[PDB]
mmCIF file of C-alpha atoms (C1' of nucleotides) and ligand atoms in Angstrom:
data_model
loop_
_atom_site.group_PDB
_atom_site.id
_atom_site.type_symbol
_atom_site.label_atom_id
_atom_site.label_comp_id
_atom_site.label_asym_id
_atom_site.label_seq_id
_atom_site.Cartn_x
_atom_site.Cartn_y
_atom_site.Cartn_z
ATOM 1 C CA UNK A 1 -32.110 14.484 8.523
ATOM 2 C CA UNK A 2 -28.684 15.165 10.139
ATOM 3 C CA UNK A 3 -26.492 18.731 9.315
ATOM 4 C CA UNK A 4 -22.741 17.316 9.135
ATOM 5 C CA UNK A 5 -20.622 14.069 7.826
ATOM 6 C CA UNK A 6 -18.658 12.786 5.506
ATOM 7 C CA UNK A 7 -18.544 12.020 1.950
ATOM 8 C CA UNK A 8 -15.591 9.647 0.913
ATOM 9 C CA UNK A 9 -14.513 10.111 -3.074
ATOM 10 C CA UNK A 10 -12.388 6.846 -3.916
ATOM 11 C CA UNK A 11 -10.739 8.006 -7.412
ATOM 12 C CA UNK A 12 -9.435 4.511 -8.956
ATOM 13 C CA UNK A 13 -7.630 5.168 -11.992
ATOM 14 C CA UNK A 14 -9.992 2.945 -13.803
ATOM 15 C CA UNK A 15 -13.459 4.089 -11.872
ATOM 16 C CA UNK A 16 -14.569 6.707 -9.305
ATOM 17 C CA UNK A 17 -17.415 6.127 -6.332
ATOM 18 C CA UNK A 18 -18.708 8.609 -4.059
ATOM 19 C CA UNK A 19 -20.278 7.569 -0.826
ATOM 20 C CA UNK A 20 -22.201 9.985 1.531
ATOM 21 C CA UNK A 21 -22.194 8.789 4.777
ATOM 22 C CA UNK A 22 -22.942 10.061 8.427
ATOM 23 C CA UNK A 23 -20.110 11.512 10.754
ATOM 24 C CA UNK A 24 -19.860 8.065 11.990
ATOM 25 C CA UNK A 25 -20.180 5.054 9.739
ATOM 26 C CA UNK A 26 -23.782 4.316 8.221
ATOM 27 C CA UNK A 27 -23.617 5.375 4.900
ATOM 28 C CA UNK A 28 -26.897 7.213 3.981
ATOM 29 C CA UNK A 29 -26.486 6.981 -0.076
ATOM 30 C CA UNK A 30 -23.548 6.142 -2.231
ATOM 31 C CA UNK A 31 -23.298 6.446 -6.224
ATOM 32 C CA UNK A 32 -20.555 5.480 -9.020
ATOM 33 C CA UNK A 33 -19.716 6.214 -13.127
ATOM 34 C CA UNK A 34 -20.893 2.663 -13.253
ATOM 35 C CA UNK A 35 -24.779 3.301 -12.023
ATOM 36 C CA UNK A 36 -24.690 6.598 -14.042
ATOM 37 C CA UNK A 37 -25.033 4.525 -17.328
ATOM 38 C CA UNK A 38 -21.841 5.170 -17.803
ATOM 39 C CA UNK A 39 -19.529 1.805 -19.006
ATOM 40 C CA UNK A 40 -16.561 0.566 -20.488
ATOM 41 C CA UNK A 41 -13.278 3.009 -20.281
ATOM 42 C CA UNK A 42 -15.731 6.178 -20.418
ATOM 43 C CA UNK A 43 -16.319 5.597 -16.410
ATOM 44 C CA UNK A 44 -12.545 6.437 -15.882
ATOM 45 C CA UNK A 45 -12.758 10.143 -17.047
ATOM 46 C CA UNK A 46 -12.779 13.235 -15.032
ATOM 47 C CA UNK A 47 -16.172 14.634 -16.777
ATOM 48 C CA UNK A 48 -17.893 11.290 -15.408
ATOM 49 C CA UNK A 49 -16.581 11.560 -11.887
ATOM 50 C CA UNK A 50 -17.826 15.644 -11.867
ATOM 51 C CA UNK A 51 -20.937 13.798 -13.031
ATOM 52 C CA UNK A 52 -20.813 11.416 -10.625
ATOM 53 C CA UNK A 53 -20.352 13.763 -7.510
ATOM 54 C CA UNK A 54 -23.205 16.232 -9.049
ATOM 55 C CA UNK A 55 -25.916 13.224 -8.644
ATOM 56 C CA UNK A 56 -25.052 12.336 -5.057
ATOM 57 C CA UNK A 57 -24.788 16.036 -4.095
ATOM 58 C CA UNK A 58 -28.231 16.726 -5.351
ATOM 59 C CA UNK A 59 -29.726 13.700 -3.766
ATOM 60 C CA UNK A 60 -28.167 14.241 -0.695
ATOM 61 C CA UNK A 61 -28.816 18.137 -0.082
ATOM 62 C CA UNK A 62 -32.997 17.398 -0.941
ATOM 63 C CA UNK A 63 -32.266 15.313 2.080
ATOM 64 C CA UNK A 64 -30.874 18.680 4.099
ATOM 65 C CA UNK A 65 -27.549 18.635 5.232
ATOM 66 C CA UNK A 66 -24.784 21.668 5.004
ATOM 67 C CA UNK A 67 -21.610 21.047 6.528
ATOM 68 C CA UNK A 68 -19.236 18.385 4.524
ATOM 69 C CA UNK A 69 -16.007 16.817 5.585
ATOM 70 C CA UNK A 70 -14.491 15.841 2.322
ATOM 71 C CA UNK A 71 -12.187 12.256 2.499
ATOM 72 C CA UNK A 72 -10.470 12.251 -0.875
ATOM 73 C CA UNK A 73 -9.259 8.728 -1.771
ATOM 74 C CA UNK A 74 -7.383 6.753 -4.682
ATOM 75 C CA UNK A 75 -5.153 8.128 -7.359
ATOM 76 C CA UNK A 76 -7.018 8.086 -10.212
ATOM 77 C CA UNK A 77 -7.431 11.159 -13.174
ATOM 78 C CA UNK A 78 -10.900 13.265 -12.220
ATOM 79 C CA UNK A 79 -9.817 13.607 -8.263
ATOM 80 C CA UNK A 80 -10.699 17.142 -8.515
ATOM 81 C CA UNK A 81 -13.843 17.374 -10.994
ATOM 82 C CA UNK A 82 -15.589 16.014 -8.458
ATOM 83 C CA UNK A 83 -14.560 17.849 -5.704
ATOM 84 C CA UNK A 84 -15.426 21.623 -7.944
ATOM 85 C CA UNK A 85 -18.529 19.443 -8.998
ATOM 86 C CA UNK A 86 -19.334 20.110 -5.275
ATOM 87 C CA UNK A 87 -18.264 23.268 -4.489
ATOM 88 C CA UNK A 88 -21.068 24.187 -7.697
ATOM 89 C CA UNK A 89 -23.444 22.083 -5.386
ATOM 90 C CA UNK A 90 -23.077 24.833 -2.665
ATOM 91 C CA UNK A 91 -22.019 22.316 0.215
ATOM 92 C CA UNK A 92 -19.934 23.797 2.701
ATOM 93 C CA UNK A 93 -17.103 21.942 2.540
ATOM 94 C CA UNK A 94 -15.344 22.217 6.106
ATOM 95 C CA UNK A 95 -11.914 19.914 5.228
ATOM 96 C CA UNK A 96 -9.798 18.241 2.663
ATOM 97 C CA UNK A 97 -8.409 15.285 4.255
ATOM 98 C CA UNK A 98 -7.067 12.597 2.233
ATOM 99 C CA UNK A 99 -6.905 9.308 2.638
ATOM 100 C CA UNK A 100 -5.069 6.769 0.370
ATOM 101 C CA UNK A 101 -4.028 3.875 1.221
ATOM 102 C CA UNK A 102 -0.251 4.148 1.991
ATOM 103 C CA UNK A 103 1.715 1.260 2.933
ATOM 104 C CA UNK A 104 5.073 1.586 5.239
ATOM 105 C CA UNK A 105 6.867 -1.291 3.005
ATOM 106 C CA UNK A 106 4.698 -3.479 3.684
ATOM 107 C CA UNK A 107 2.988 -6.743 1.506
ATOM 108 C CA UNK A 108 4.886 -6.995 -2.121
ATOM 109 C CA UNK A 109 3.476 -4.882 -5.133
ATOM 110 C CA UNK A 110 2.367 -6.624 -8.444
ATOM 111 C CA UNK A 111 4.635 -6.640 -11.128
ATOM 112 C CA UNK A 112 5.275 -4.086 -13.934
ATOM 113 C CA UNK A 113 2.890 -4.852 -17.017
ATOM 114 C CA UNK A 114 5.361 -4.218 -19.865
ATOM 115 C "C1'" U B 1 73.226 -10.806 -1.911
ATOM 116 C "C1'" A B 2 73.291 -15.412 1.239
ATOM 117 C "C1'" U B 3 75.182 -17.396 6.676
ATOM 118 C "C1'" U B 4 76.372 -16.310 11.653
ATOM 119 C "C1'" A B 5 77.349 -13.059 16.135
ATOM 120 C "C1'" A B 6 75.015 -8.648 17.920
ATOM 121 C "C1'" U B 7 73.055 -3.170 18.386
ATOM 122 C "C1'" C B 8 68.847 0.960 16.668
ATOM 123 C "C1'" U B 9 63.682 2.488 15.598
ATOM 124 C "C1'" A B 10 61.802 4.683 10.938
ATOM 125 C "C1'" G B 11 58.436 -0.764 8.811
ATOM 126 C "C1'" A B 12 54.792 -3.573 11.338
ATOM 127 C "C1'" G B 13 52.274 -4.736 15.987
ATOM 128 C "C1'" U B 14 50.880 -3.936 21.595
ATOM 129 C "C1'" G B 15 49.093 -0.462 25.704
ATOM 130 C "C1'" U B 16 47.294 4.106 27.448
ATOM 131 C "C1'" G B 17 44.096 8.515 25.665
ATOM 132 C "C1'" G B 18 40.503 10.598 22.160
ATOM 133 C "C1'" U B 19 36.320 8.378 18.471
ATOM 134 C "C1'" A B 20 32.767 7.604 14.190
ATOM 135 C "C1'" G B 21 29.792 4.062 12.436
ATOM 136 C "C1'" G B 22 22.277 0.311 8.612
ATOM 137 C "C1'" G B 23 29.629 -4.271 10.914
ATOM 138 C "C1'" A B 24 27.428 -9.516 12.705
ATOM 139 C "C1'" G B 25 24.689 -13.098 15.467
ATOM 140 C "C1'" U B 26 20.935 -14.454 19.404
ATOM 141 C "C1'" U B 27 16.381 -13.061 22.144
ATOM 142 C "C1'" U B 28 12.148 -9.783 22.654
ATOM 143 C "C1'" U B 29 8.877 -5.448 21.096
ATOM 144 C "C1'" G B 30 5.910 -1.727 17.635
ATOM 145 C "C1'" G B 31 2.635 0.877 13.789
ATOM 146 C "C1'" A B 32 0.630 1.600 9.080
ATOM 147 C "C1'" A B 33 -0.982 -1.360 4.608
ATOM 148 C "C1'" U B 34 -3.002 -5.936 2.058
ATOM 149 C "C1'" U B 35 -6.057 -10.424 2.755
ATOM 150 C "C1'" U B 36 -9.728 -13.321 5.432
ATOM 151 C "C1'" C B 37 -13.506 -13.504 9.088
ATOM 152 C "C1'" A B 38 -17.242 -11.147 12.644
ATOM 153 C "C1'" U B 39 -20.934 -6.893 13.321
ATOM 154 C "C1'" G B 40 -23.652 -2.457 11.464
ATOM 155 C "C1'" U B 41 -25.280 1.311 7.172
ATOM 156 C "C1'" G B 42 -26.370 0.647 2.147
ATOM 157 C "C1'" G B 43 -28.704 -0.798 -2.701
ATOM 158 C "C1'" A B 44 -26.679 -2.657 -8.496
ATOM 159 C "C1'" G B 45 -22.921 -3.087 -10.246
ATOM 160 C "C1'" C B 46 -17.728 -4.094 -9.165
ATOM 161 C "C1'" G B 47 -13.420 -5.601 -11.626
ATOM 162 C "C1'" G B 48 -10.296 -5.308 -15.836
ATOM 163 C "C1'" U B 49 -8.494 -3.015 -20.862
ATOM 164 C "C1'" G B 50 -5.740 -0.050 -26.457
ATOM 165 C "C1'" A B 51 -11.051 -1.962 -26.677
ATOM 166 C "C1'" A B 52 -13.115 -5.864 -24.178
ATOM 167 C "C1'" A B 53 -14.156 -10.627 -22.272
ATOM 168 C "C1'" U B 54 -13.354 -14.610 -18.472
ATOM 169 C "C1'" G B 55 -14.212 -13.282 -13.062
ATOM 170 C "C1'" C B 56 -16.868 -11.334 -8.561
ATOM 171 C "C1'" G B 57 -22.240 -9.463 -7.329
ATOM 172 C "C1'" U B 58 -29.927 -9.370 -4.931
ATOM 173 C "C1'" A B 59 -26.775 -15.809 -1.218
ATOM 174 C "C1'" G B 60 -26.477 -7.858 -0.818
ATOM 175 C "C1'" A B 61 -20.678 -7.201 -4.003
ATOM 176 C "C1'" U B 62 -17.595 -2.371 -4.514
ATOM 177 C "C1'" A B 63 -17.837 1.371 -0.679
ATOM 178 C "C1'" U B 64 -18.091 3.093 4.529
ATOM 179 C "C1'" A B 65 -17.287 2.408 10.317
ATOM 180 C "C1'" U B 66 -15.412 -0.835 14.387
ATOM 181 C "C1'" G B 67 -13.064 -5.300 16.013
ATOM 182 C "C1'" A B 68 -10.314 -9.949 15.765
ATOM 183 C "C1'" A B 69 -6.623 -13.364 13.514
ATOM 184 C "C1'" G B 70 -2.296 -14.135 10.658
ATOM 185 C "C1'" G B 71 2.042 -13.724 7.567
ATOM 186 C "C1'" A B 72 5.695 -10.732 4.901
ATOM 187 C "C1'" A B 73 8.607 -6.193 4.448
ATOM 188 C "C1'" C B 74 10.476 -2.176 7.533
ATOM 189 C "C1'" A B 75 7.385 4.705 4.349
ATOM 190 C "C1'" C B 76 9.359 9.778 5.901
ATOM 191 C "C1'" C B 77 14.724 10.086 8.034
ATOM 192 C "C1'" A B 78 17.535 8.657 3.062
ATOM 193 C "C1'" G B 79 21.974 11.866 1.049
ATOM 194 C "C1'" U B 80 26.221 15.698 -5.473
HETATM 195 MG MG1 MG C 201 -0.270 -4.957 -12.957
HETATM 196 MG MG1 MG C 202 -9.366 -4.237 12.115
#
RNA sequence: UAUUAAUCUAGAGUGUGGUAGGGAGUUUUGGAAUUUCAUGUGGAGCGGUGAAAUGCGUAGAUAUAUGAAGGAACACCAGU
């Protein structure tokens, strides 16, 4: 029921989730590898975040909206399947902001599994 | 060479004049990020791994938006 906002694509390097939300808060509908079916180390690979996006794109546009604002999060390995998974939607994606969490030096990292 | 009586400035210092620094201590200040809590949207997983399982989750988690509190360390600059 509304034209623009934003969909935020968090990319974990174990999982992906892609929540599409209004211009402003208030996420309308959100969807992740995990509530695909999708489990075990399988959710962590680029087909299954293209997958992912492709859901939440069609659910979203039967709801009618046309201009996107893309927030691309995390580091993971399918940060761009999803985003071309998109594109095939036919969204009109208006920017490419990203938005990882970057700290300035601050709080100690864990330690390096070895 | 050592001792003593003295002279000199080149050794080493002092002053004047230029001058580069994350040199140190004391007292204040700032923003991201993590965590917790508060308020909305939301609806089934999240998390983790070589693969999983403890664990967290319909008491509404992960996520998203705003705010508050608090501690620690000071991205880029940053380097033949
Ligand atoms: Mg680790
Ligand atoms: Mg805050």
């Amino acid at each position: 029921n509304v034209s623009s906002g934003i969909i935020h694509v968090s990319c974990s390097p174990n999982n992906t989730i892609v929540s599409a939300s209004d211009p402003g808060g208030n996420v309308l509908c959100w969807a992740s590898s995990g509530t695909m079916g999708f489990k075990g180390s399988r959710k962590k690979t680029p087909y299954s975040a293209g997958i992912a996006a492709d859901k939440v794109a069609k659910t979203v546009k039967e709801m009618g909206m046309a201009t996107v604002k893309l927030f691309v999060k995390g580091t993971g390995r399918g940060k761009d399947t999803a985003i071309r998974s998109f594109a095939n939607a036919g969204l009109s994606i208006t920017e490419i902001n990203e938005k990882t969490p970057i700290p300035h030096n601050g709080c100690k990292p864990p330690k390096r599994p070895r």
